[PDB]
Scaffold this active site. Structure first.
Site, short mmCIF file in Angstrom:
data_model
loop_
_atom_site.label_atom_id
_atom_site.label_comp_id
_atom_site.label_asym_id
_atom_site.label_seq_id
_atom_site.Cartn_x
_atom_site.Cartn_y
_atom_site.Cartn_z
N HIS A 1 0.86 -1.21 0.00
CA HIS A 1 0.00 0.00 0.00
C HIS A 1 0.89 1.24 0.00
O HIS A 1 0.79 2.09 0.93
CB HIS A 1 -0.97 -0.04 1.17
CG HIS A 1 -2.09 -1.00 0.98
ND1 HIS A 1 -2.26 -2.08 1.79
CD2 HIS A 1 -3.12 -0.99 0.11
CE1 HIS A 1 -3.36 -2.72 1.44
NE2 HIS A 1 -3.91 -2.07 0.41
N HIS B 1 1.67 1.74 -5.69
CA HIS B 1 0.24 1.32 -5.71
C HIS B 1 -0.63 2.52 -6.07
O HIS B 1 -1.54 2.38 -6.90
CB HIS B 1 -0.20 0.71 -4.37
CG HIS B 1 -1.67 0.48 -4.32
ND1 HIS B 1 -2.28 -0.51 -5.05
CD2 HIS B 1 -2.66 1.11 -3.64
CE1 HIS B 1 -3.58 -0.48 -4.80
NE2 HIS B 1 -3.84 0.52 -3.96
N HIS C 1 -5.82 7.73 -2.66
CA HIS C 1 -6.83 6.81 -2.09
C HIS C 1 -6.26 6.01 -0.92
O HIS C 1 -7.07 5.55 -0.06
CB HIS C 1 -7.41 5.92 -3.21
CG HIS C 1 -6.69 4.63 -3.40
ND1 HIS C 1 -5.57 4.54 -4.21
CD2 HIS C 1 -6.91 3.40 -2.89
CE1 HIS C 1 -5.11 3.30 -4.18
NE2 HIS C 1 -5.92 2.57 -3.37
N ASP C 2 -4.93 5.79 -0.86
CA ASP C 2 -4.32 4.99 0.24
C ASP C 2 -3.34 5.84 1.04
O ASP C 2 -2.44 5.26 1.69
CB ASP C 2 -3.70 3.70 -0.28
CG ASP C 2 -4.68 2.55 -0.38
OD1 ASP C 2 -5.60 2.48 0.47
OD2 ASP C 2 -4.52 1.72 -1.32
N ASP D 1 -8.43 -0.41 -7.98
CA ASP D 1 -7.71 -0.71 -6.72
C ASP D 1 -7.17 -2.14 -6.81
O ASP D 1 -6.13 -2.40 -6.22
CB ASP D 1 -8.61 -0.49 -5.51
CG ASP D 1 -7.87 -0.33 -4.19
OD1 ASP D 1 -6.64 -0.11 -4.25
OD2 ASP D 1 -8.53 -0.45 -3.13
N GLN E 1 -6.12 -17.57 -3.33
CA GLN E 1 -6.21 -16.72 -4.55
C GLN E 1 -7.43 -17.10 -5.39
O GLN E 1 -8.14 -16.16 -5.82
CB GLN E 1 -4.95 -16.82 -5.40
CG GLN E 1 -3.75 -16.12 -4.78
CD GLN E 1 -4.01 -14.64 -4.67
OE1 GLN E 1 -4.05 -13.92 -5.67
NE2 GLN E 1 -4.24 -14.18 -3.45
C1 LIG Z 1 -13.96 -10.12 1.91
C2 LIG Z 1 -12.46 -10.08 2.23
C3 LIG Z 1 -12.05 -11.26 3.14
O1 LIG Z 1 -12.17 -8.87 2.93
C4 LIG Z 1 -11.69 -10.11 0.90
N1 LIG Z 1 -10.83 -11.32 0.76
C5 LIG Z 1 -9.50 -11.21 0.46
O2 LIG Z 1 -8.98 -10.11 0.36
C6 LIG Z 1 -8.57 -12.38 0.31
C7 LIG Z 1 -8.88 -13.70 0.77
C8 LIG Z 1 -7.93 -14.70 0.60
N2 LIG Z 1 -6.74 -14.45 0.03
C9 LIG Z 1 -6.38 -13.24 -0.42
C10 LIG Z 1 -7.28 -12.15 -0.29
N3 LIG Z 1 -7.01 -10.86 -0.79
C11 LIG Z 1 -6.16 -10.63 -1.83
O3 LIG Z 1 -5.51 -11.51 -2.38
C12 LIG Z 1 -6.05 -9.25 -2.33
N4 LIG Z 1 -6.65 -8.25 -1.67
C13 LIG Z 1 -6.61 -7.01 -2.10
C14 LIG Z 1 -7.32 -5.98 -1.26
C15 LIG Z 1 -7.16 -5.92 0.28
C16 LIG Z 1 -8.35 -6.65 -0.32
C17 LIG Z 1 -5.95 -6.68 -3.28
C18 LIG Z 1 -5.32 -7.69 -4.03
C19 LIG Z 1 -5.37 -9.01 -3.56
N5 LIG Z 1 -4.77 -10.06 -4.26
C20 LIG Z 1 -3.77 -9.79 -5.21
C21 LIG Z 1 -3.17 -8.53 -5.27
N6 LIG Z 1 -2.21 -8.36 -6.17
C22 LIG Z 1 -1.84 -9.35 -6.98
N7 LIG Z 1 -2.38 -10.56 -6.95
C23 LIG Z 1 -3.34 -10.81 -6.09
MG LIG Z 2 -7.33 1.32 0.80
ZN LIG Z 3 -5.53 0.72 -2.57
#
Ligand SMILES: CC(C)(O)CNC(=O)c1ccncc1NC(=O)c1nc(C2CC2)ccc1Nc1cncnc1
Ligand SMILES: [Mg+2]
Ligand SMILES: [Zn+2]
EC number: 3.1.4.17
Length: 313
Positions: free
Chosen positions: A68, A72, A106-107, A217, A269
């Site tokens: 973040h 980003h 935004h972050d 995002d 993922q």
């Molecule tokens: C509903 C809930 C649990 O809050 C959402 N669930 C998950 O976030 C969740 C659940 C399980 N495993 C990974 C999770 N989250 C992510 O992998 C992820 N999250 C974000 C934002 C904060 C969320 C952005 C990118 C993301 N993946 C990614 C990023 N860049 C490159 N490749 C992949």
């Molecule tokens: Mg944010």
């Molecule tokens: Zn962000």
């Protein structure tokens, strides 16, 4: 006024593509950002002297976190550029100015911890802002930097346009709270499928800008596989530190955030791509058809994670 920003040829070509990667040269990012404002908004939108001091003060208030971070901010702003450049006629002049600045900001001042952990840690920001804790803080930092002397990039706007844009930015920044995404998409989903989606209804625009902000995002999931793969390493670095901090409070963290459960990541993922990303970019392609590439890219990366699980890498 007659000074234009220009980029090397490869960047100049690739920057118009949704899957552009801004590259590892920190010092190129501000010129990349201002080149997108210029082409997305106009050369006359912002006093170049005031814009630069705003960009540099924003860069300063991003922290040295794994994910973040400053890169980003600029990565997300570029994804908004690609969407605005492929939907030329759909957005007003204030939305084009407000959204590019909304994404960069935004972050702002992210520490690398979710709203959950602020609430469990009992951080003062959780007392002040009970929902979208981090996101309301991000907006507050944006208004702070806007009011530093020499930083009011909107100085040519009227009293009311100024208020319209800061309102665009506030809603735009709040929406980046994923907890709000699930409901917001399901309302656009229905509206589009009953055919009551009305882009002249202001409450419908708000929802759509919101669905864009989510899309931009998460846009690291819509890049080429080697970029998405290596960006995942950065996002998990944050999750695992937060897991460690959760254990320090005497709370077993969710598996996503436990670094003893890295075997579960490929499967984790899948659920994310299925539960969040593929739906986000599905409904956005239904509302803004020229954004179809982001879906295709997302689908390709989902398919690469299935190949990690099937031991093909
Ligand atoms: C509903 C809930 C649990 O809050 C959402 N669930 C998950 O976030 C969740 C659940 C399980 N495993 C990974 C999770 N989250 C992510 O992998 C992820 N999250 C974000 C934002 C904060 C969320 C952005 C990118 C993301 N993946 C990614 C990023 N860049 C490159 N490749 C992949
Ligand atoms: Mg944010
Ligand atoms: Zn962000």
């Amino acid at each position: 006024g007659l000074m234009q920003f220009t980029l090397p040829v490869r960047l100049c070509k690739e920057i118009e593509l949704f899957h552009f990667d801004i590259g590892p040269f920190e010092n190129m990012w501000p010129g990349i950002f201002v080149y997108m404002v210029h082409r997305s908004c106009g050369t006359s939108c912002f006093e170049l002297e005031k814009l630069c001091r705003f960009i540099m003060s924003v860069k300063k208030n991003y922290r040295r976190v794994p994910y973040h971070n400053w890169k980003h901010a600029v990565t997300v702003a570029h994804c908004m550029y690609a969407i605005l450049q492929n939907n030329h006629t759909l957005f007003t002049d204030l939305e084009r100015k407000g959204l590019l600045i909304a994404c960069l900001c935004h972050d702002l001042d992210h520490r690398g911890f979710s709203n959950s952990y602020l609430q469990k840690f009992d951080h003062p920001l959780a007392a002040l802002y009970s929902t979208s804790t981090m996101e309301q803080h991000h907006f507050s930092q944006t208004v702070s930097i806007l009011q530093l002397e020499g930083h009011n990039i909107f100085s040519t706007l009227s009293s009311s346009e100024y208020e319209q844009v800061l309102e665009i930015i506030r809603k735009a920044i709040i929406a980046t709270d994923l907890a709000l995404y699930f409901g917001n998409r399901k309302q656009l989903e229905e509206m589009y499928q009953t055919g009551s989606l009305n882009l002249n209804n202001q409450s419908h625009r708000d929802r759509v800008i919101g669905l864009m902000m989510t899309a931009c995002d998460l846009c690291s999931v819509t890049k080429l596989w080697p970029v998405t793969k290596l960006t995942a390493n950065d996002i998990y670095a944050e999750f695992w530190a937060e897991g460690d901090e959760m254990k320090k409070l005497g709370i077993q963290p969710i598996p996503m955030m436990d670094r003893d459960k890295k075997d579960e990541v490929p499967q984790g993922q899948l659920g994310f791509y299925n539960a969040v990303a593929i739906p986000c970019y599905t409904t956005l392609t239904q509302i803004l058809p020229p954004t179809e590439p982001l879906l295709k890219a997302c689908r390709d990366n989902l398919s690469q994670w299935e190949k990690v699980i099937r031991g093909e890498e």
